[PDB]
Symmetry: C3
Subunit: 145 residues, 3 copies
């Protein structure tokens, strides 16, 4: 799945980026079964003050998580996953929840490419892991915590 994380520049240090990305990947794989390496966490940093809420300019603390998922998961499980991301980014980034916004958008996997391959749907992903395999299977194996 793709996790766009919008943050102000220099609110997350390198270690805190590694921590938040770990937490998000851990939550996603824990709740969906997705293989670790399929989770992109992609940090979009902008200068603090680029964020407005109700027209009031903000400091550097607001974190917005735009998660792009395959269609096919239950509303209950998406609710759990988003809450757990709220909690776990609170902890990893060591920031209060009030600054955490979380949105999941869903597409058909048939229009979703990861690592250059069309995603299967959660009716697969164990079987899916065949692929352009070898160079591909092994390129994925490394991008795992």
């Amino acid at each position: 799945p793709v996790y766009m994380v919008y943050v102000s520049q220099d609110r997350l240090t390198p270690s805190a980026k590694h921590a938040v990305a770990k937490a998000i990947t851990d939550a996603h794989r824990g709740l969906t079964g997705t293989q670790h390496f399929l989770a992109q966490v992609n940090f979009q940093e902008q200068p603090a003050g680029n964020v407005f809420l109700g027209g009031v300019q903000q400091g550097g603390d607001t974190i917005f998580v735009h998660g792009l998922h395959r269609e096919g998961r239950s509303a209950d499980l998406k609710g759990q996953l988003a809450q757990r991301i709220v909690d776990d980014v609170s902890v990893a980034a060591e920031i209060d929840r009030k600054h955490i916004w979380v949105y999941f958008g869903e597409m058909p996997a048939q229009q979703m490419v990861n690592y250059g391959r069309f995603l299967p749907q959660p009716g697969h992903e164990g079987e899916w892991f065949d692929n352009l395999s070898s160079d591909e299977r092994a390129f994925m194996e490394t991008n795992v915590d």
Copy 2:
């Protein structure tokens, strides 16, 4: 709402960013009834030349707005909201309509959180506010202008 606003770097001065964030905030609350403080504006600045149209590179004038809503509103009203955003950002930012792109994507409210809480349905944002935590109500009340 979360409004992603993609613009070329330092094309809007901070004061102009404030003006565009108030155009958008005012538009969403006027047509939807939502609070003021629920409107996030997140400016993504990239250097000029990053926007290509028909393969032709651009200067710093393109504004692209990706507004993320929860589902439940009519097409008629969404068109009115997008049109008003086109016009009022044109004035606040001092840019022509021909440079303005606006896209609304919709999600179920149950898979969208912010200020650390799951959104309600568009029918009734008063309930949700009065039922939130007191510390959270007060933090949201600070982001209103």
Copy 3:
């Protein structure tokens, strides 16, 4: 369409940006019939290290393409389009296919604006064009390469 392209900073030379944008514009125009100038390519550069896969930080090579489309096109056509984008970007940008992710999201044409004007349905693009103002038509005609 708007094609959000997430890239590592200063990994694409200006000419490589022109090549990637042209590759995506030509793919969309060729496979769908839309006019050249309707293809927006928006490059979002972040410093290498902002991208995590399975919790592992990457060098400056991961590319993610988030395409924003109107509704109405078939899964077959979207699949070919995503595949063509993967291949044509792999060559234009000189990147391996395993570094390429592509996601298409779709909205109703009535909640979508380009050049300050409401998009039509995909069965409409030519009839749609001629009735735009003569200045809006001509600003569009220059955005063709």
